[PDB]
Structures are given as structure tokens and as C-alpha cells.
Amino acid sequence: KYQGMRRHLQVTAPRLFDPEGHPPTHFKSAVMFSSTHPYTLNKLHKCIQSKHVLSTPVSCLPLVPGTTQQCVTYYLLSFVEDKKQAKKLKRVVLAYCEKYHSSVEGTIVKAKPYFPLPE
Amino acid sequence: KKYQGMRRHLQVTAPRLFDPEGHPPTHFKSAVMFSSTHPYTLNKLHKCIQSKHVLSTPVSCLPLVPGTTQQCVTYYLLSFVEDKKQAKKLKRVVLAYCEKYHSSVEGTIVKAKPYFPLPEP
């Protein structure tokens, strides 16, 4: 399921997507991927998983009062070790999506001191 | 309504931040991730940490970290605010309350470059 994207990522970024090896000690960064199409983000939730990248399920952003949004913007977070890895993850995922999922946007995110995942 | 207590607390403690009227900021550059293994508590925070200047997501789950000793899902939500100042304030207020009434809750300052992908008015 999503073999296509999975294999693409494993090839384009073998280290980041090595399903084998050891998680980083802390996840200081992430990429928020957002889109009005939850089905697409769900594809990403399935594909963007490894030892070095952990992704939340798809959820929703809150509506901003005083705008006329016609549609919920969904999102997920993909946690990675640091800023280097986040830049890379965003680059690779979006190169793909640019052709096959243009509804998808990515935003670099950072936590102090790091995201609250166990050690 | 429900959680009237926590709501009133937040608005008295930080009036501008939790003013239910006014104008949202133009961009939300920061947020606080509030997390906990208790989803019911985070549902409370979800209905409560809302205003014109603070917007919170529904409760979701963090992914499990391979090869660790928890076997307990950790839930979270994000509360978006204008910037680092407002995030520091929001975290302080919410956690002063929770420190007494919800010791399971943690707060983490988060920042987005250039800002979080919420629309603009």
C-alpha cells in the first residue's frame, strides 16, 4: 500500500528512511504537512515512518475567526532529529508531492528543548 | 457551560490573550504543544484553550518511539499564538493551573518558519 512513495523515499533518502537502525535521542524538529485533502495526508502518514522519522496521524487545524474558510485544513507532523533532517525531509516529500499531490504544503517546525517523545 | 471554571480562570489570569472578542493576529508563528497520557484531560484543554488569540487543534496522538518502554500512547494538542512572547505566557498560565489540577499535563514551546499554515484575514 503506497509502495510507490515508500520505495521512492527509501531510495532518495536511505538514511532518513532506514526502517532499521536506531532512533535519534531527541526529536528537536518536525515538518508539518498540511492540505485540504485528508486522504492525501493519510497517505503521507503511512509512508513517512521509519527509525528516524515518526509521523502523527492526520488531524485538523482550527478555523481562524474572521475569515471565511470554506474547508478544513488538515495536517500531520513528522518528527525528526534536528533542523538538518527537517529541511531534507521537506525537500524530498515535496519534490514528490509537487507532481502527484499539489495540495500538499510543508512547514518547518522546531521545539525547545525538543518534542515530548519518550527517550 | 462545562469547564467554566478553567475558562474563567484563564480569562482573568490573562485577559488579552484569552479575550473571546477582538481580532486574531495576522500570523501564528508559535504554539504550545500540551501533551499527556490522559486523553480526557486534553479534551478539557481543547475546549478551554480557545480565544481570538489562541487557537487549539483537537486532541491527537504522538507516534510511538521504536524500542522504548512506554506502551502508553501520549496524546497532544497544539495551541497556536502570535509569537514567542505569547507562547511563553500561554504555557505559564496553563501549567500553573495544571500543576495543581492536572499533573499529567506537559507543555512544550514550538516555533514555525515563517509561521504556521493557518489562513490570513
Author numbering:
A (entry chain B): 142 to 260
B (entry chain A): 141 to 261
Please quote the authors directly:
Latency-associated nuclear antigen (LANA) mediates γ2-herpesvirus genome persistence and regulates transcription. LANA mediates persistence of episomal DNA and thus is required for long-term maintenance of viral genomes in dividing cells, a role central to viral latency. The ORF73 from MHV-68 encodes a much smaller, 314 amino acid, 50 kDa nuclear protein (termed mLANA thereafter) which lacks the extensive internal acidic and glutamine-rich repeat region of kLANA. The C-terminal region of mLANA, comprising amino acid residues 140 to 263, has amino acid similarity to the kLANA DNA-binding domain.
The structure of the C-terminal domain of mLANA was determined at 2.2 Å resolution. The crystallized domain contained residues 140–272, designated mLANA140–272. The tertiary structure of mLANA140–272 exhibits an α+β ferredoxin-like fold which assembles to form a dimeric eight-stranded anti-parallel β-barrel that is central to its functional architecture. Each monomer contributes an anti-parallel 4-stranded β-sheet “half-barrel” from which helix α2 and α3 pack onto the plaited sheet with their axis parallel to the strands of the sheet. Size exclusion analysis confirms that mLANA140–272 is also a dimer in solution. In total, seven phosphates ions were located at the surface of mLANA. Five of these are situated on the ventral face while the remaining two cap the dorsal side of helix α1. Therefore, we consider the ventral face as the putative DNA binding site of mLANA. Electrostatic surface analysis of the mLANA protein reveals an extensive positive patch on the dorsal side which includes residues Arg-156, Lys-224, 225, 228, 229, 231, 251, 253, and Arg-232. The positive electrostatic surface also encompasses the identified 226QAKKLK231 motif that is involved in binding to BET proteins.
